[PDB]
């Protein structure tokens, strides 16, 4: 329950991410692709690699779907709480949230089984990597995989002002708080809850933003040291594993950041609507 993030990107929808599994699955995807791009004759294996990863993802999602009944119960409680007795309504929110997390933990073994399959497949591909001479293995796999799978994400990140998104959220949180205090009720207890929700979401966004910024710089510097050059086989495998670690850590926070950003602004509409209702209707 410490490494589980909850997202609500759109009204009436809820999902969850077990953070170490996302990172784990993502890591072995980079490792697999690096293993097939090292030789030009194994490029065509990408169809099989894509198809295996797709099967793993569907298998993982099918395990997630087992908690759909508990999940939709929580969703309908959130709708009641966000669309205006509050202690009873909030107590039912915490208990339903607790059932969701217990449902997720009761399927850890199913989740781990699918994760171990991805690891084994990626490692089997990794183990077949060969060189013309082990004293100077090529790094074409590292270069190609970066150019075709990673570079677009680094540029998409660099094209954003993630720090400004945080200041925009902090200002929204501060101004909405100062609004509550200079007010004058079921509408008040509701606004305090969504504000508390948006505040936790914001701290999660801030957590991932810091990661993205660190990893953005780390990746861009490390990739320069690992391409258009050769390495002894032991060193090549080490750098591939290191790149795949950086990539997966970057991709997890980037992924979660976007989903959390959407959740924050999905909640803000409720906040704004309940404020406009407390003023113009009442």
């Amino acid at each position, epitope marked *: 329950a410490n490494s589980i993030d909850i997202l609500q990107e759109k009204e009436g929808h809820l999902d969850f991410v077990i953070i170490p599994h996302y990172t784990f699955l993502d890591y072995y995807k980079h490792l697999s692709y690096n293993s097939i791009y090292h030789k030009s004759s194994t490029y065509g294996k990408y169809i099989a690699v894509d*198809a295996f990863i797709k099967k793993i993802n569907e298998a993982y999602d099918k395990v997630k779907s087992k908690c759909n009944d508990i999940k939709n119960d929580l969703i309908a409680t959130i709708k009641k709480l966000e669309h205006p007795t509050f202690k009873k309504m909030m107590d039912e929110y915490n208990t339903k949230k607790k059932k969701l997390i217990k449902c997720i933990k009761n399927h850890e073994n199913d989740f781990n089984k699918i994760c171990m399959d991805m690891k084994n497949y990626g*490692t089997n591909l990794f183990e077949q990597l060969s060189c013309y001479n082990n004293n100077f293995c090529n790094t074409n796999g590292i270069r190609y995989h970066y150019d075709e799978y990673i570079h677009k994400l680094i540029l998409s990140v660099k094209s954003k002002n993630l720090n400004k998104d945080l200041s925009d959220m902090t200002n929204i949180l501060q101004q909405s708080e100062l609004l509550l205090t200079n007010l004058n009720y079921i509408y008040i207890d509701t606004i305090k809850f969504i504000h508390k929700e948006m505040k936790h979401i914001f701290n999660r966004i801030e957590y991932h933003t810091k990661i993205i910024n660190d990893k953005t710089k780390i990746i861009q510097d490390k990739i320069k040291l690992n391409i258009w050059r050769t390495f002894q086989k032991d060193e090549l495998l080490k750098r591939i594993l290191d790149m795949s670690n950086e990539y997966s850590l970057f991709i997890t926070s980037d992924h979660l950041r976007q989903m959390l950003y959407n959740t924050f602004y999905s909640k803000e509409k409720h906040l704004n609507n309940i404020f406009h209702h407390l003023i113009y209707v009442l």
Partner: antibody, heavy 120, light 110 residues
Framework: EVQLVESGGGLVQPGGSLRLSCAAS????????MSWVRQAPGKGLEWVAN????????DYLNSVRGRFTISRDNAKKSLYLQMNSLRAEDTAVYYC?????????????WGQGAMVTVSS | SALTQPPSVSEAPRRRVTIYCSGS????????VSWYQQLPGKSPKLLIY???LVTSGVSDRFSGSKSGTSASLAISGLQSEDEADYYC???????????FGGGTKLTVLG
């Protein structure tokens, strides 16, 4: 390269006990689910048992529950099938197999097979 | 057996062969289908898994498919070397075990 070698087959009396062993090599045995599959002479394949990497989950064919125990020892890279209360219908070649992907329940590596005969 | 396969199928070389695996919603309908080739006197080997993935090293003439409660294995550009017994398997939720098909013997003509 990847290899699975069975041992411990033979003739057993009905109601008797027999233990099969499987020596694995050429792969990280500790990271995979492992299995047993049997084939009666001239007949089809029939799954017997699966076991998780650390042994915490074990699955069995309905007709062998309570009588058979699948076990492993990752340090020795060995798979086991303790067969108790043997019946004539248990007579078959028993294959040690690797279950990969385990989410797919796929027997991707097979041994040479160990003959087990339950007769009076 | 919970999965129904033709006892035998046959086709001339250079052509395409299909082998069906008929099951139910507790097995094929909800689980991944595997396919195996067993040559005479040999141990079985995996051909297809996750319904339609081809195991590494297996020829691309072997393909898999599944829809509803029925799965199928296709062999194209047939060779007499393909003469063997073919099995389908999948997990069954009601039995909590693997159900195997009864097998299909492949006869290459001519």
């Amino acid at each position: 390269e990847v290899q699975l070698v069975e041992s411990g087959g033979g003739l057993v009396q009905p109601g008797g006990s027999l233990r099969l062993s499987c020596a694995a090599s050429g792969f990280t045995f500790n990271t995979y689910w492992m299995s047993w599959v049997r084939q009666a002479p001239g007949k089809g394949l029939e799954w017997v048992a699966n076991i998780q990497q650390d042994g915490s989950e074990k699955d069995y064919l309905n007709s062998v529950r309570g009588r058979f125990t699948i076990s492993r020892d990752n340090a020795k890279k060995s798979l086991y099938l303790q067969m108790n209360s043997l019946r004539a219908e248990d007579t078959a070649v028993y294959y040690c197999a690797r279950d990969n992907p385990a989410s797919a329940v796929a027997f991707d590596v097979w041994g040479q097979g160990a003959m087990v005969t339950v007769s009076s | 057996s919970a999965l129904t396969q033709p006892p035998s199928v046959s086709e001339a070389p250079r052509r395409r062969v299909t082998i069906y695996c008929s099951g139910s919603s507790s097995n094929i309908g909800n689980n991944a289908v595997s396919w195996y080739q067993q040559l005479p006197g040999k141990s079985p080997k995996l051909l297809i898994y996750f319904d339609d993935l081809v195991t590494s090293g297996v020829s691309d003439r072997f393909s898999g498919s599944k829809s509803g409660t029925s799965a199928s294995l296709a062999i194209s550009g047939l060779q007499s070397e393909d003469e063997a017994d073919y099995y389908c398997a999948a997990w069954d939720d009601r039995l909590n075990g693997v159900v195997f098909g009864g097998g299909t013997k492949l006869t290459v003509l001519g």
